[PDB]
Design a protein around this ligand. Structure first.
Ligand SMILES: O=C(O)CNC(=O)C(=O)O
Ligand SMILES: [Mg+2]
Ligand code: NI
Ligand SMILES: [Zn+2]
Length: 331
């Protein structure tokens, strides 16, 4: 069995290997990359996502989100408070202001320490989930707006044409902006490209051990757990690496830098934080191997999760027994 310890693997495809996305995902899996839940892909040196980032300041962040924490430094939830619209150029200035800028630090490890010690005492503002792309239309390899759609994959595997579209999203971050522990909708893959700026630190639980994280989370967030049997779908809970290690939960960590891709694999729980002002693009995708995960994915039906239009068909076709309850939670 490849990668039996479930370590995060880092890949350096050549330009030739970068031409066929699906083939390279399958290659990574043949080497056991999915067992970690997360992989890094460093593009060939010949590749670029676009020519420059000099002309992005007028992009609008219609609803920046202030991420307010409740709990203790290693075990907390966050809610999102909506803020007034602002442009990327305004957000970038905000991120670099004294209130929000990255502190002095020695290295990624020192900054990690500072994040877990101090995050709860501040409320950073995140421009998340903005539909759009920063890939040049002429970038033909690993362009996250030109991947094969999940609706086409489900049709190719199962024979049923479904409605829905699959487009990318932009994330504009600042120091301490935080992504809570989650798997993807319908336990899909995700791919995330860090276009510019400061790094993103990731934590990940192997898919084979996801239920260990879920059991701990029920213990640590007992009011949330009562409310919903899949409350990690709410995407509000944070647990630090120190607390995970105290509770024997298998996990790994890695820092992504600008110009690097990360892929999250089906049922790979992940969480993390941004080091400073940055912009990432991400999108969900599927492969044949996903289908069995999709059919078994847990679902939130309490109302909290609320998701995209295009999830409906995935539940309806893959999980017909669950669909009526889930749809009620949608409405
Ligand atoms: O970058 C972010 O804030 C969160 N990203 C992801 O969870 C992802 O790409 O799957
Ligand atoms: Mg612009
Ligand atoms: Ni994710
Ligand atoms: Zn729920």
């Amino acid at each position: 069995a490849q990668n039996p310890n479930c370590n995060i693997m880092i890949f350096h495809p050549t330009k030739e290997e970068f031409n066929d996305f699906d083939k390279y995902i399958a290659y990574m899996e043949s080497q056991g990359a999915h067992r970690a839940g997360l992989a890094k892909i460093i593009p060939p040196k010949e590749w670029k996502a676009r020519e420059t980032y000099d002309n992005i300041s007028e992009i609008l962040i219609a609803t920046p989100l202030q991420q307010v924490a409740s709990g203790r430094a290693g075990v907390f939830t966050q809610y999102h408070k909506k803020k007034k619209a602002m442009t990327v150029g305004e957000y970038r200035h905000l991120a670099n202001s004294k209130k929000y800028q990255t502190p002095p630090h020695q290295n990624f490890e020192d900054l990690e320490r500072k994040y877990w010690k101090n995050r709860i005492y501040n409320s950073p503002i995140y421009g998340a989930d903005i539909s759009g792309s920063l890939f040049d239309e002429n970038t033909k390899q690993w362009n996250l707006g030109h991947l094969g759609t999940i609706q086409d994959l489900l049709e190719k595997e199962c024979g049923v044409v479904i409605e829905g579209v699959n487009t990318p999203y932009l994330y504009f971050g600042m120091w301490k902006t935080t992504f809570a522990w989650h798997t993807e909708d319908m336990d899909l893959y995700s791919i995330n490209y860090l276009h510019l700026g400061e790094p993103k630190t990731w934590y990940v639980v192997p898919p084979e051990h996801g239920q260990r994280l879920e059991r701990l989370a029920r213990e640590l967030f007992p009011g949330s757990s009562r409310g919903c049997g899949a409350f990690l779908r709410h995407k509000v809970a944070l647990i630090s690496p120190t607390v995970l290690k105290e509770n024997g939960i298998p996990f790994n960590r890695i820092t992504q830098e600008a110009g690097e891709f990360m892929v999250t694999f089906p049922y790979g729980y992940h969480a993390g934080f941004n080091h400073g002002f940055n912009c990432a693009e991400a999108i969900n995708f599927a492969t044949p191997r996903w289908i069995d995960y999709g059919k078994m994915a847990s679902q939130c039906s309490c109302g909290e999760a609320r998701v995209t239009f295009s999830m409906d068909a995935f539940v309806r076709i893959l999980q017909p027994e669950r669909y009526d309850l889930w749809k009620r939670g949608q409405d």
